Amino acid sequence: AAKDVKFGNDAGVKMLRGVNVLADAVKVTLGPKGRNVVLDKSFGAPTITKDGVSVAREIELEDKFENMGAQMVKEVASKANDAAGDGTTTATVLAQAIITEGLKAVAAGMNPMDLKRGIDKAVTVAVEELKALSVPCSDSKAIAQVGTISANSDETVGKLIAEAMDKVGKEGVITVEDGTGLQDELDVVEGMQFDRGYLSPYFINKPETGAVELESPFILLADKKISNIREMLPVLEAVAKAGKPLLIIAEDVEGEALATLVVNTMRGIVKVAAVKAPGFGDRRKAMLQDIATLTGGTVISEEIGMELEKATLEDLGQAKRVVINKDTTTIIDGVGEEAAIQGRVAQIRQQIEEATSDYDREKLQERVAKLAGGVAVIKVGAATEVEMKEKKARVEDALHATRAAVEEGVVAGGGVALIRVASKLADLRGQNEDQNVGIKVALRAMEAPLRQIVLNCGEEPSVVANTVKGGDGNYGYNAATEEYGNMIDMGILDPTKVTRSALQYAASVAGLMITTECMVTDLPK
């Protein structure tokens, strides 16, 4: 259709207005004193939230160009979310800060490309510096603290997460479900859990959790790669009857075969999901067997001259339920008999005795623990369905944040880490003045998170910012108590990973907008 086309400044003011509406709506929810945002619903009462992502999803503007600016920066939160699962609001205020000053510099006549280069250089060095300052979240105490902090100071949620990770390990699978009513519940189910997700989406039958769930399915344990569907045809049909879904746990399911499975299960033609076998090399085969012993199946390896074509429903393993995430497979309640299973345990138990290497020893103990990984399930307390659904949300977020914290060290929270980094880069320079302005734009935007947190408290941003910059190290402002102190000692930490991600995605989208010269959209008609 006929288009409306805008250039330079005309386009710039439109974009800026669009990012401001989005960022302003989102940033009021930042930190312990975040404010509420009410989102209208077509039916019933409006939604009241302090969740940034929830607000962003609702933002769409009337002016086509302003809407483009809003949808562009909205990409910042979504990418930061996908990558770290937290810090989307932080990423949004960093982006607004960089875009605002960057566009001002452009309007002033500065070279957009140089501005972007300067911003990029500052971010590159800032990230290195962020790593240098990064400390860990390994022990259960740290995990508890981060969990508590991520749960709005709810020490309860903190303990839960810590206990759940103590059961299945901090790398294990953990889920949260509605509670039976009052008092939380934590139980490990099959069963076993290993680090391997679906070999492709679509298998996802429950987009609510973005996971795949199968009930009383058959489990094919093939010790090899599967490229040709032909091999599956015989077993797939055997499973076609008995009306039960099939879980493929092979060394890997490549294009040809995988593509077919995706299409067939897409047409209701037999429900089948595929995931890679745990580990690699030798231990892979040994582990693929542990699953067999657990599900009562039989490994189909070519090493013993076995063919998938010559595989009956008797070779297949089976369990009451199996769940698979983007990167986790959990088999709940397997058919395997305690005789075989417990016997398998005894075997591996001796393996540990004959262990001549710590590495081999560790790997073996990992198997016995799993067989004797599973899935830790957290059932949220209650006392009224409303509160129960709420606490469930908090536990979910706290878990998500703590998981991120465990993966990559931690740094002082409350926006102080970025402020310390910015101060260390005061002498950073580029190839020219415009690049230097870009560097300064980035260092200035690095104070935005702390300033917005303070602003949401009802305090003065410049005063608090000035005071924090005055000290050093982990010295920061505790917005919950409105007292200065050592952020680490007060338990206010952020996973280095979310801080880094927030900054990189903010600078990335900001750089693109700053170097945008023209915009095209449908004519308002």
Ligand X SMILES: Nc1ncnc2c1ncn2[C@@H]1O[C@H](COP(=O)(O)OP(=O)(O)OP(=O)(O)O)[C@@H](O)[C@H]1O
| Cβ atoms 165, 406 nearer than 8 A | yes
Residues 6+ apart with CB under 8 A from 439: 118, 119, 121, 122, 425, 428, 429, 430
Q: Choose among 364, 323, 348, 453: nearest CA to 31.
A: 453
**Residue 326 identity:** K
**What does the per-residue mask of binding to K ion show for 28-47, with x meaning CB under 5 A?**
-x----x-------------
**363 labelled ligand-binding:** no
- Fill in the per-residue mask, 92 to 111: x = in contact with its own copies (CB under 8 A), - = not in contact: ------------x--xxx--
Instruction: By CB under 6 A, tell whether 438 contacts ligand X.
Output: no
Q: What's the CA gap between 83 and 47, in Å, rounded?
A: 26
**If contact means CB under 5 to 8 A according to the sort of partner, which of Mg ion, its own copies, K ion, none does residue 34 touch?**
K ion
497 in a labelled binding site: no
CA 501/CA 81 separation, integer angstroms:
9
Taking CB positions, which residue lies at the least distance from ligand X? 413
**Is residue 303 left, alpha or beta, with left meaning phi > 0 and alpha meaning psi from -120 to 50?**
alpha
Q: Which stretch binds Mg ion (CB under 5 A): 74-82, 83-91, 200-208, 349-357?
A: 83-91
Quick one: what does residue 172 bind among its own copies, ligand X, K ion, none, with the CB cut-off 5 to 8 Å set by partner type? none
Judged by beta carbon, residue 261 or residue 410, the one nearer Mg ion is 410
Q: Does 265 interact with K ion (rule: CB under 5 A)?
A: no
323 binds ligand X (CB under 6 A): no
Let me know the angle formed at the C-alpha of 276 by 377 and 348, rounded to the nearest 5 degrees: 70
> Is the Cα dihedral 512, 515, 518, 524 positive or negative?
positive
415 forms part of the interface with ligand X (CB under 6 A): yes
Nearer CB in complex with its own copies: 109/255:
109
Looking only at the bridges linking them, the beta strands covering 173-177 and 375-379 are parallel
Is 495 one of the binding residues for ligand X (CB under 6 A)? Answer: no
32 annotated as ligand-binding: yes
Confirm whether residue 328 is marked as ligand binding: no
H-assigned helices in 29-184: 52-58, 64-84, 88-107, 112-133, 140-150, 155-168
Q: For the stretch 234-245, what's the b/e string if a residue is b when 16 or more beta carbons lie within 10 angstroms of its beta carbon? A: ebbebbeeeebb
Q: Does 51 bind Mg ion (CB under 5 A)?
A: no
Nearer CB in complex with ligand X: 414/430: 414
Indicate whether 86 belongs to the interface with Mg ion (CB under 5 A). Answer: yes
Which region, judged by CB under 5 A, interacts with Mg ion, from 80-88, 103-111, 318-326, 463-471? 80-88
# binding residues, ligand X (CB under 6 A): 24
Told to check if 102 binds ligand X by CB under 6 A, we report no
Complex with Mg ion: residue 86 or 184, whichever CB lies closer: 86
Using DSSP, state whether 193 is helix, strand or coil.
Answer: strand
328 binds, among its own copies, ligand X, K ion, none (CB under 5 to 8 A by kind): none
CB of 92 to ligand X, least distance (A): 8
State the number of binding residues for its own copies (CB under 8 A).
4
Among 12, 18, 69, 87, binds ligand X (CB under 6 A): 87
Q: Which two tokens stand for residue 2?
A: 């006929």
Q: Judge whether 503 is annotated as a binding position.
A: no
Structure tokens at 137: 């979240």
> For residue 322, what is the enclosing H or E element?
strand 317-324
CA–CA distances in Å: residue 502 to residues 10, 80, 93, 508: 29, 6, 9, 10
Q: Which does 109 bind (CB under 5 to 8 A by kind): its own copies, ligand X, K ion, none?
A: its own copies
Amino acid at 97: A
Is 112 or 491 the residue whose CB approaches its own copies more closely?
112
User: 41-80 mask for ligand X (x: CB under 6 A)?
Assistant: ----------xxx---------------------------
Quote the least distance from Cβ 480 to ligand X, whole Å: 3
DSSP code of 54?
H
Q: How far apart are alpha carbons 210 and 164 in whole angstroms?
A: 21
Q: What are 268's two structure tokens?
A: 């209701």
CB of 508: closest distance to ligand X in angstroms? 17
Binding residues for its own copies, per CB under 8 A?
A: 104, 107-109
Binding residues for Mg ion, per CB under 5 A?
A: 86
Binding residues for ligand X, per CB under 6 A?
A: 29-32, 34, 51-53, 86-90, 149, 413-415, 449, 453, 478-480, 492, 494
Binding residues for K ion, per CB under 5 A?
A: 29, 34, 50
